[PDB]
Amino acid sequence: GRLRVVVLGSTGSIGTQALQVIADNPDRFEVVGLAAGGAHLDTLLRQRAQTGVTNIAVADEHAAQRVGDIPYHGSDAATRLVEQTEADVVLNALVGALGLRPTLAALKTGARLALANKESLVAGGSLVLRAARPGQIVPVDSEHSALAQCLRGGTPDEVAKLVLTASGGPFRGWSAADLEHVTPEQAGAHPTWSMGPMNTLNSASLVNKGLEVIETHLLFGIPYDRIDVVVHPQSIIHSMVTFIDGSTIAQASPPDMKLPISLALGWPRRVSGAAAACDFHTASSWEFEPLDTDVFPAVELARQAGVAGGCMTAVYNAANEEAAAAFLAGRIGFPAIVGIIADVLHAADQWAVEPATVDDVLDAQRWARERAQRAVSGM
Amino acid sequence: GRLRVVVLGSTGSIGTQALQVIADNPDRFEVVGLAAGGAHLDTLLRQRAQTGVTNIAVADEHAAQRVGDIPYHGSDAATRLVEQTEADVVLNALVGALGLRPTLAALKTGARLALANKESLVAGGSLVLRAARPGQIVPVDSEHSALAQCLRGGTPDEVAKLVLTASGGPFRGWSAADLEHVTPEQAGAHPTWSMGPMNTLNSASLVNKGLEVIETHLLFGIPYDRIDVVVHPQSIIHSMVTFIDGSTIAQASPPDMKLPISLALGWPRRVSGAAAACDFHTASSWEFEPLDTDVFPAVELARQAGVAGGCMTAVYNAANEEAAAAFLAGRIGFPAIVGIIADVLHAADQWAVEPATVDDVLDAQRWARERAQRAVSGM
Numbered sequence: 038g039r040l041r042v043v044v045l046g047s048t049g050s051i052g053t054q055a056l057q058v059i060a061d062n063p064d065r066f067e068v069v070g071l072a073a074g075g076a077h078l079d080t081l082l083r084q085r086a087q088t089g090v091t092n093i094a095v096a097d098e099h100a101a102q103r104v105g106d107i108p109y110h111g112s113d114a115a116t117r118l119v120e121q122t123e124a125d126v127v128l129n130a131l132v133g134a135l136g137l138r139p140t141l142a143a144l145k146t147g148a149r150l151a152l153a154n155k156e157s158l159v160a161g162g163s164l165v166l167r168a169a170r171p172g173q174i175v176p177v178d179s180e181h182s183a184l185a186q187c188l189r190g191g192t193p194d195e196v197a198k199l200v201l202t203a204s205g206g207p208f209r210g211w212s213a214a215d216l217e218h219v220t221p222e223q224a225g226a227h228p229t230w231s232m233g234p235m236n237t238l239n240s241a242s243l244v245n246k247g248l249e250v251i252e253t254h255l256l257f258g259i260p261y262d263r264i265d266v267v268v269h270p271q272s273i274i275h276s277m278v279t280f281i282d283g284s285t286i287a288q289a290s291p292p293d294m295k296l297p298i299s300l301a302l303g304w305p306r307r308v309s310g311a312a313a314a315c316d317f318h319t320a321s322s323w324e325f326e327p328l329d330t331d332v333f334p335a336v337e338l339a340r341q342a343g344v345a346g347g348c349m350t351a352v353y354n355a356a357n358e359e360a361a362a363a364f365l366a367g368r369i370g371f372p373a374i375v376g377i378i379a380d381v382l383h384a385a386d387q388w389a390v391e392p393a394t395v396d397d398v399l400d401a402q403r404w405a406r407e408r409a410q411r412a413v414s415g416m
Numbered sequence: 417g418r419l420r421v422v423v424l425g426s427t428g429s430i431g432t433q434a435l436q437v438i439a440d441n442p443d444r445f446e447v448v449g450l451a452a453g454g455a456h457l458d459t460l461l462r463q464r465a466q467t468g469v470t471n472i473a474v475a476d477e478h479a480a481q482r483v484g485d486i487p488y489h490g491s492d493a494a495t496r497l498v499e500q501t502e503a504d505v506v507l508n509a510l511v512g513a514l515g516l517r518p519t520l521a522a523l524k525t526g527a528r529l530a531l532a533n534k535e536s537l538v539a540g541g542s543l544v545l546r547a548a549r550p551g552q553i554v555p556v557d558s559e560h561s562a563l564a565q566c567l568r569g570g571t572p573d574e575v576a577k578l579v580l581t582a583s584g585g586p587f588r589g590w591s592a593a594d595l596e597h598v599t600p601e602q603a604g605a606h607p608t609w610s611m612g613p614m615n616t617l618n619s620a621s622l623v624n625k626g627l628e629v630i631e632t633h634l635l636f637g638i639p640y641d642r643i644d645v646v647v648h649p650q651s652i653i654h655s656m657v658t659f660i661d662g663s664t665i666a667q668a669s670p671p672d673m674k675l676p677i678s679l680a681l682g683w684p685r686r687v688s689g690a691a692a693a694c695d696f697h698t699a700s701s702w703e704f705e706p707l708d709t710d711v712f713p714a715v716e717l718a719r720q721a722g723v724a725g726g727c728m729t730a731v732y733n734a735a736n737e738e739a740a741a742a743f744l745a746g747r748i749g750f751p752a753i754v755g756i757i758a759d760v761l762h763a764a765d766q767w768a769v770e771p772a773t774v775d776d777v778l779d780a781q782r783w784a785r786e787r788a789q790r791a792v793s794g795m
C-alpha cells in the first residue's frame with residue numbers, strides 16, 4: 038500500500054531529496070506533512086503549492102507572520118505537527134538540538150522514524166532508545182543504511198564486527214606537521230549553497246566519523262570495541278559487517294544519498310530505480326587503508342565518550358560545535374579542534390549520569406559549550 | 417545433536433579441508449562416511465584412523481583390495497555408500513561428471529547436499545533439480561556461497577543481477593597469441609587458490625567460470641542475461657548481488673575454502689572461527705576489470721549451452737573433460753581446449769532435449785566425449 042510520510046526539515050538537502058523520491062514513487066509514498074525552520078520559507082510555500090499539502094509547520098514566528106495561513110507555527114511547531122498528523126513514516130531531517138523533541142513525539146505516535154537528525158541519537162541517547170521500540174528507528178545516513186543492509190547476512194548473535202568506511206577527508210594521509218597549517222578554506226569551508234560549513238569540517242576532522250560510530254552503537258547495540266573504521270577514499274563501499282565465521286558482507290553503490298533515503302522511507306522494501314548501481318564495464322579499484330589514530334584521534338575520543346555513556350556523547354558533540362566554529366573564525370588552529378574536545382571530555386565526568394529529560398541533555402550541552410569557550414579563550 | 421556428514425572425495429583438496437572443519441567442530445559435525453578414488457591410500461588410511469570411520473567407499477577395485485575390508489568398492493561404491501548410510505548432510509567433493517549418480521542418490525535420501533562437485537549439477541541440469549526439494553542443494557563453491565549470503569539482502573523480486581567474480585587465472589591480460597604457447601606447467605599455476613590440477617586448469621581456461629555461470633542459473637533460477645562475470649584478481653570479493661534500487665551487496669574474505677565449506681555443512685548457521693576475516697588494519701585494494709571475452713570465450717559458450725538447456729550443459733562439461741585431458745597429456749595446445757568445446761557444442765543440436773533419466777544425460781556425455789575425440793584427432 039501507500040505510506041503516509043511526514044517530512045521534517047523539508048527545505049534542506051535530505052528533505053528535498055526525499056520529496057523527489059516520493060514524487061518519483063506515488064505508488065509507494067504520499068506526503069501528509071511538511072515542517073521547516075523559516076530561513077527557506079519561500080521554498081516551503083512552493084512545496085505547499087506543488088504538493089498540495091497544507092499541513093505545514095514553520096518554527097520561526099517572524100517567518101510565519103509573512104503567511105497567515107500556517108496551521109503550525111512558533112517553537113515546537115514541528116512537534117505539534119507530528120503529534121496531530123496520522124502518518125506511517127516520519128522523516129526527521131531537522132538539523133541540530135531541535136530535532137530531539139520531534140523524534141520523541143514521532144516515536145510516541147507509533148510511526149516508523151526515518152532518522153537523519155544526528156542529535157536525536159548523539160545527544161538524546163538513552164532518552165531516545167528507551168522511547169523507541171525494536172525496528173522503529175531506521176537510519177538515513179549512508180554508513181548506517183549500509184550496516185542495516187549488511188546485518189541481513191546473519192543473526193544478531195553471528196555479528197563479530199561492524200566496519201564503517203570513512204572517506205578520510207581532504208587531509209587523508211597528512212602528518213601532524215601538515216595539519217598544523219590547515220586553513221578554513223582547505224577544510225572545505227566554502228559558502229556551498231546546500232550543506233553548511235560544519236559537515237565538510239567534521240568530515241575533515243574525523244569527528245563526523247566519531248559521531249557515526251556513536252550512532253552505530255546506539256542503533257545496532259554493538260559494543261564500541263567491535264565497531265571499526267577503515268579509510269576508503271572512493272566511498273563506494275558504504276560500510277561492512279564481519280560475522281563470527283570470518284565472512285564479511287559489504288554494501289556498495291556510487292555515491293548518491295537517494296539510495297539510503299529511499300530505503301529508509303520504504304524499509305524493509307527497496308525502491309526500484311532509486312539510484313544507479315555499480316557498473317563493472319570499466320576497470321576500477323576500491324582501496325582501503327588504516328586511519329592513523331595518533332594524527333586523527335576523533336574516533337577514539339568518540340568511543341571513550343560513548344563508553345562513559347549518559348550525556349557524555351552530548352558533551353563530545355557540543356564541544357565539537359564550539360571548537361569547530363572557533364577554528365572557522367580563526368581563533369584556534371585545526372589540530373586544536375579535537376584537542377579541545379579531549380580537554381572538555383576529560384573534565385566532564387559529572388555528565389555520565391543518564392538524562393531523565395530533554396532539559397538534562399540541554400544542560401549537558403550548555404556546560405560543554407562554555408567549557409570549550411574557556412579552553413579556546415584561555416580563561 | 418551433531419550433523420552426520422558423508423564426505424565424498426575425502427582425500428582431495430575440498431575433502432581434506434572439510435574434514436579439518438569437522439575435526440575443529442565436533443559439537444556441530446560428525447563424519448559417518450568417506451568416499452575416494454583409491455589413488456591416495458596413504459591419505460585415506462590416515463583419514464580412517466583419525467575419524468575412526470570404517471564406512472568407506474573406494475572406486476578402484478585393485479586399490480580397495482590392497483586395503484582389505486573396504487565395505488564399498490567399484491565404480492558404484494560412492495553411490496552405494498550414499499544410498500546405505502544414514503546422514504544429515506552429504507558433502508559431494510568428487511571431481512567431474514562422475515559425481516552425477518552420487519549427487520542424485522544423495523538428494524533421494526532427503527539429506528542436505530553440500531555441493532562442491534559443480535559438474536554433477538552442470539551435467540544433471542533439470543534432472544538434478546527435479547530430485548531436489550527447495551534449498552536441499554547448498555553450494556560449497558565460493559561464488560555461490562557468496563551469492564546465497566548476499567541474496568539475504570532483499571526479497572527475490574528485488575534481485576536485479578547476480579555478479580560472479582573471477583580471478584582471471586594465471587593468464588589474465590594475455591593475448592590470444594600469448595595463449596598459443598601455454599604449457600601444462602604454466603596452466604598448473606594459480607594466483608589465489610590451491611586446488612587439484614583439473615580445477616586449476618579450468619580456472620586458467622575460464623571454463624571453471626563458465627561452469628559456475630551455469631551452476632548459478634540452476635541453483636538460483638536467474639536468467640543467463642542477468643548473470644554477470646567480472647574479473648577480480650584478488651579473489652577477496654567472492655560474488656555480489658545488485659538489487660533493483662541500485663544497491664549491491666557483496667561477500668568478502670581472504671581466499672579460504674573452509675569458509676564456504678563450513679557454511680554449507682551447517683547451513684543456515686555460521687561456524688565460529690572457520691576462517692580468517694578481512695584485515696582492515698593494513699592497506700589493500702580490491703580491483704575489478706572486464707573479462708576479455710574475445711581471448712576467453714568459455715563463459716559465453718557456457719551461456720550459449722545454458723540457454724539451449726536440456727543436455728547441452730552436460731555436453732559443455734564432457735567436451736571440456738576430454739579436451740582438458742588432451743591438453744594435460746601434451747596432445748593439443750591451450751587454446752584448443754575452448755576451441756574443441758565450441759566445435760562440439762555447435763554440432764550438438766539433438767541434445768537440447770530435457771533429460772528424463774540419468775541415461776539421457778549419460779547418452780549426451782558419451783556423444784560429447786566421442787565428438788571431442790574427433791576434434792582432437794583432426795589437430
Ligand SMILES: NC(=O)C1=CN([C@@H]2O[C@H](COP(=O)(O)OP(=O)(O)OC[C@H]3O[C@@H](n4cnc5c(N)ncnc54)[C@H](OP(=O)(O)O)[C@@H]3O)[C@@H](O)[C@H]2O)C=CC1
Pocket residue numbers: 045046047048049050051052072073074075076077078095096097115130131132133135153154155178231232233294
Ligand atoms: N546531508 C547529508 O548527507 C547528511 C545529513 N546528516 C544530517 O541529517 C540532517 C538533515 O540533513 P540536511 O538536509 O543536510 O540538513 P539541512 O541543514 O540541509 O536542512 C535542515 C532543515 O531543518 C530545518 N530547520 C531548521 N531549524 C528548525 C526549527 N527550529 N524547527 C523546524 N525546522 C528547522 C531547516 O529549515 P530552513 O531551511 O527553513 O531553515 C531545513 O529544512 C542534518 O542535521 C545533517 O547533519 C548526516 C550525515 C550527512
Ligand SMILES: NC(=O)C1=CN([C@@H]2O[C@H](COP(=O)(O)OP(=O)(O)OC[C@H]3O[C@@H](n4cnc5c(N)ncnc54)[C@H](OP(=O)(O)O)[C@@H]3O)[C@@H](O)[C@H]2O)C=CC1
Pocket residue numbers: 424425426427428429430431451452453454455456457475494508509510511512514532533534535556557558609610611612613615673
Ligand atoms: N579445490 C578447490 O579449492 C575447489 C574445488 N571445487 C570443486 O570441488 C570438487 C572437488 O574438487 P577438488 O577437491 O579440488 O578435487 P581433487 O582432485 O582435489 O579431489 C578429488 C577427490 O575425488 C576422488 N575421486 C577421484 N575419482 C574418483 C572416482 N571415480 N570415484 C570416487 N572418488 C574419486 C579423489 O580420490 P583419490 O584422488 O584419493 O583417488 C579425491 O578425493 C570439484 O568439482 C571442484 O570443481 C570448487 C571450488 C574450489
Ligand SMILES: O=CN(O)CCCP(=O)(O)O
Pocket residue numbers: 556557558559581582583584585609618619620624625
Ligand atoms: O570456488 C572457488 N573456486 O572455484 C576457485 C575460483 C578460481 P577462478 O575464479 O579463477 O575460477
Ligand SMILES: [Mn+2]
Pocket residue numbers: 178179180249
Ligand atoms: Mn555519513
Ligand SMILES: [Mn+2]
Pocket residue numbers: 557558559628
Ligand atoms: Mn568457484
